[PDB]
Design a protein around this nucleic acid. Structure first.
Ligand SMILES: [Zn+2]
Lengths: 108, 149, 279, 166
RNA sequence: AACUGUCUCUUAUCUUUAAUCAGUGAAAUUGACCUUUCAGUGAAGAGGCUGAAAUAUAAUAAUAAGACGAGAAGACCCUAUGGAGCUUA
RNA sequence: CACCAACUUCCUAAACUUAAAUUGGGUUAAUCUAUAACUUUAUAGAUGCAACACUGUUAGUAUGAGUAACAAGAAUUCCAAUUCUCCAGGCAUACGCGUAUAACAACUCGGAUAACCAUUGUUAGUUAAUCAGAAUAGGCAAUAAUCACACUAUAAAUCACCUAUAACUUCUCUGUUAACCCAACACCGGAAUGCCUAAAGGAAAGAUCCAAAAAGAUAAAAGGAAAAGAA
RNA sequence: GUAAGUUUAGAUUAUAGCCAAAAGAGGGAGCUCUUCUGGAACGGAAAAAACCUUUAAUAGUGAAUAAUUAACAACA
């Protein structure tokens, strides 16, 4: 079955310009205090998350080199230490990861 | 028609879902923080919490050893669960896993993204939300009400 | 490419027509535009009016102060119409007042002033002059001619006409061309009357007549959103005037307006003014 | 092809006289060649019409459509030139006066099928037009109240003239 | 004969489709259409005529019984003091 | 005890009497030439001189319709990175193709989307004495193979070496890449031989939802046409 | 009452209706024919090629008229 006649632009225009078919505005936009960038109320910041995710790779890269092989996951707890920080007695008996950078302000 | 459903349909079948969940659980244990789709992350959150209980049960438990071996493909992790994860969560009675929403992937599919991590980990803290301080005008007004009461 | 020169020329005219509609040219006075002869137009202007004008005086009346400045400014890089202007305006005021008084002796002097002011208003004078082509014949440094300058020339021409043709011809000219504009003009349209009830009482006491007692003769749709109220003013229990209104206050106000017209003999059915008289 | 939108940015007004209000700035920006459907892009344009510069940008940042990202890029370029070349003091003082999309030159190809059939393949391109006016978006319209409607209806009745009568 | 959801008598689960987001993007078709119901009229015949009736604008989602639905050079048999072609003993 | 209603008729101004093949007569759009005119005109002479309609021809742009339609195993420390989950015709030659090979740089076009390139541009490539391709005249021949022996059979199944003549010291040329071919297409199709069957070769999941309806698959209380047995 | 007609010469085109209404013949309903008559609204009969009122067609914010779906139980 094919259309019996051409559909008029006016009829077509009304269909596409009906409110149901139009793009709706969003009121859930929020600001990120940490980075000062926009975010949604139910969505986290990304500018700061970029630092966190990349820092994780840098920390993970250090971990990968230290292990040196697959299936080498330690059976003991692990800790990350940055330059200017010295291991404590409580840190004994735990895998220690050394980071050349200083302790990040956000990281505690 | 998803009324009363308590299980998500993932993978190519129920076995694939277990294997896909098994792979996700193994990866999470190794790294302690993994980013995945929100639907899949929610489904696997319950499994991770129960796994910590199995570690708490004890190494000598035959069921735990069988459970740990099946769920963890990489066998180096089996000592870790009983000697790293289980000792860490001994004080905790639950809520071992923290799941939060991440901005959706800009990969042309706009999948809902979430991050699931084990609490008490050595990884850098996630950017968690901070509640409003009591110094705010509304809270201070409520503080005055509290003092009167 | 379509060949031929006639077709290409035809399209050029088509482009010009579109260009004219899109971008109308700025207005310019006919004096600047070609094929204009001031002397011929003045002679034709006088002949068309069937009136005798002193060419020298008429030119002075058309001459304006602003026009002289432009010539002087051009000269740096002539008689004003003020004297003639005063005569026409002053004479017109007396003559215009004379017309009103004769038809409506009862009408107060204050009312005649309002009528005279309206008939001598800048808009009224400007409308007559522009429709008479006087603007083209007006001498000024700005186009369109400013209304106050245009008004000055109109009365200035009247002063020149008085010298050329005497008051009698000018009076007929005023009656034929200016008094005609009052046709279809209601009294309160040309005269602003506030507080008609008080004014009506003021006239009645002067005539030693009792103030009317207002009564509601007829009413319809009182409680509806479209109410009609008829209020009649009863003097000594006798109806003197009745007016229609939407509210009692409006009906009373309208009824008072009708009485004022009757008091001054401005009834709608009153005898029309005469332009027939050749004398 | 016609590029009159750019020429609108080359218009130079006469020097403003002392007795004239400060002329509001008008900026026209367009992208002539976009590998996007004009019809789909129009949906984005229609919604953003009349909104502020900041509000439109904020919505675009959280939009899923590819066209929305293009619109934001177009908006940013227009804003940059406005301050750089149109002497705009406050960046925030901008609103979307006009937003529309137009058709662009396309490419034609044949669409093969596995069963010997063929189809008409087209690579769609479009143009996008936006005009930005310095200042906040105009206040929204207030719908007429019942009292206003009744007054006009009475006024309309009075305005009526008698038809076909002496 | 057995066997079984063929059926008495249907139900449940999974995959595909489906629905939503994003990217890309055809074909048959098309006089114009501001594209209703009943009865009449007519050639078996009316969204557009006659007479009644109904009727905010615009949308959105579903099903295929009938209009003895619309269709082709489809099917069958027979005729010709029809043609034409062919063969002759 | 009437009115209304037709250009029938009267009235003011005019007019001077009722369909369509065909036939008689009067004009006209456009272009060129002759001769004039000079913001596009005149008189003559000429002609590829006038399109709302041939399922006309060519081009453009709509409608159907943003509809049919199409798509990548997981995690991470990263796309010639690791590890995990699962699949099971792979490697050589022939033939064909002819630079699709490889590196770099691009992000427009091509892949029916991205990532990435198979795209665009530039530069590079495939190595052979061993792998592959590129003198003459006479004389004389009974008896297959089949582990060839026995043993049979029927479809009836192998130059050499002698006798003379002639020449008299040699390693160049060409082929060599590839994920590749025949089917209009990066087409669920077609495509010889040898070895071997996973050590080789691979990925069904663009995201979300779990609509109805429909298709495929699995399961069935009691019964068995409302198992593999006979004719 | 009215204005065409006859002859001579040249020359083609048309030569198929439709419906209504009369007169016949087949026939017995109705049909099937032959013959005569009339018709082609912009008005009317409901819409109505074929019936009725209507001589052409001009402008006017005049007038008189035509046809014109309506009609008003019985016993001496
Ligand atoms: Zn931040």
């Amino acid at each position: 079955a094919a259309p019996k006649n051409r559909r008029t632009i006016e009829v077509n225009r009304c269909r596409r310009r009906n409110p149901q078919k139009l793009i709706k505005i969003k009121n859930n936009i929020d600001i990120c205090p940490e980075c000062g960038h926009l975010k949604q109320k139910h969505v986290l910041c990304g500018y700061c998350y970029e630092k966190v995710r990349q820092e994780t790779t840098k920390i993970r890269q250090q971990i990968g080199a230290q292990e040196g092989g697959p299936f080498r996951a330690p059976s003991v707890e692990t800790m990350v230490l940055y330059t200017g920080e010295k291991p404590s007695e409580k840190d004994q008996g735990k895998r220690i990861v050394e980071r050349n950078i200083k302790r990040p302000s956000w990281f505690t | 028609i998803s009324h009363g459903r308590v299980y998500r349909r993932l993978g190519l079948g129920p076995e694939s879902r277990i294997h896909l969940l098994r792979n996700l659980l193994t990866g999470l244990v190794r790294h302690e923080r993994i980013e995945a789709t929100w639907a899949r992350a929610d489904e696997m959150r319950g499994y991770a919490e129960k796994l910590i209980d199995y570690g708490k049960l004890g190494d000598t438990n035959e069921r735990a050893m069988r459970m740990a071996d099946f769920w963890l493909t990489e066998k180096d992790l089996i000592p870790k669960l009983f000697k790293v994860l289980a000792p860490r969560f001994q004080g905790q009675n639950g809520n071992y896993t923290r799941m939060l929403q991440i901005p959706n992937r800009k990969e042309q599919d706009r999948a809902k993204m979430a991050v699931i991590e084990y609490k008490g980990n050595y990884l850098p803290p996630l950017p968690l939300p901070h509640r409003d301080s009591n110094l705010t005008l509304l809270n201070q007004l409520l503080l005055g009400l509290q003092q009167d009461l | 490419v379509k060949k031929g020169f006639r077709a290409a020329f035809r399209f050029q005219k088509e482009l010009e027509r579109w260009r004219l509609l899109r971008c109308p040219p700025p207005p310019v006075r006919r004096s600047e535009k070609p094929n204009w002869d001031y002397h011929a137009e003045v002679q034709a202007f006088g002949s068309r009016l069937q009136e005798t004008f002193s060419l020298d005086l008429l030119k002075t009346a058309f001459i304006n102060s602003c026009y002289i400045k432009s010539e002087e400014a051009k000269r740096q890089s002539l008689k004003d119409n003020q004297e003639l202007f005063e005569q026409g305006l002053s004479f017109s005021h007396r003559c215009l007042t004379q017309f009103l008084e004769d038809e409506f002796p009862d009408l107060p002097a204050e009312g005649t002033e309002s009528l005279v002011s309206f008939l001598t208003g800048e808009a009224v004078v400007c409308h007559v002059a522009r429709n008479l082509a006087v603007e083209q014949l007006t001498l000024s440094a700005e186009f369109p001619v400013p209304l106050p300058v245009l008004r000055q020339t109109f009365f200035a021409v009247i002063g020149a006409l008085l010298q050329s043709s005497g008051p009698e011809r000018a009076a007929l000219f005023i009656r034929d061309f200016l008094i005609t504009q009052m046709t279809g003009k209601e009294l309160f349209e040309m005269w602003t009357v506030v507080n008609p009830m008080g004014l009506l009482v003021e006239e009645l006491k002067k005539r030693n007549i009792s103030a009317p007692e207002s009564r509601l003769t007829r009413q319809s749709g009182s409680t509806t959103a479209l109410p009609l109220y008829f209020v009649g003013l009863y003097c000594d229990r006798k109806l003197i005037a009745e007016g229609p209104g939407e509210t009692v206050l409006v009906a009373e106000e309208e009824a008072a307006r009708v009485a004022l017209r009757k008091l001054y003999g401005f009834t709608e059915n009153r005898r029309p003014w005469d332009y027939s008289k050749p004398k | 092809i016609s590029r009159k939108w750019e020429k609108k940015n080359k218009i130079v007004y006469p020097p403003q006289l002392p007795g004239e209000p400060r002329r509001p700035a008008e900026i026209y920006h367009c992208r002539r060649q976009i590998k996007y459907s004009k019809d789909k892009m129009w949906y984005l344009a229609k919604m953003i019409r009349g909104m502020s510069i900041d509000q439109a940008l904020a919505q675009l940042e959280f939009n899923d459509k590819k066209g929305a990202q293009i619109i934001k890029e177009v908006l940013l370029e227009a804003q940059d030139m406005a301050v750089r070349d149109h002497n705009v003091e406050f960046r925030s003082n901008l609103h979307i006066a006009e937003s529309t999309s137009g058709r662009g030159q396309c490419l034609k190809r044949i669409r093969y099928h596995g069963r010997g059939r063929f189809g008409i393949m087209e690579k769609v391109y479009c143009h996008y037009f936006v005009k930005l006016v310095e200042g906040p978006p105009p206040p929204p319209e207030v719908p007429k109240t019942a009292v206003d409607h009744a007054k006009d209806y009475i006024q309309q009745l009075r305005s009526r003239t008698i038809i076909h009568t002496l």
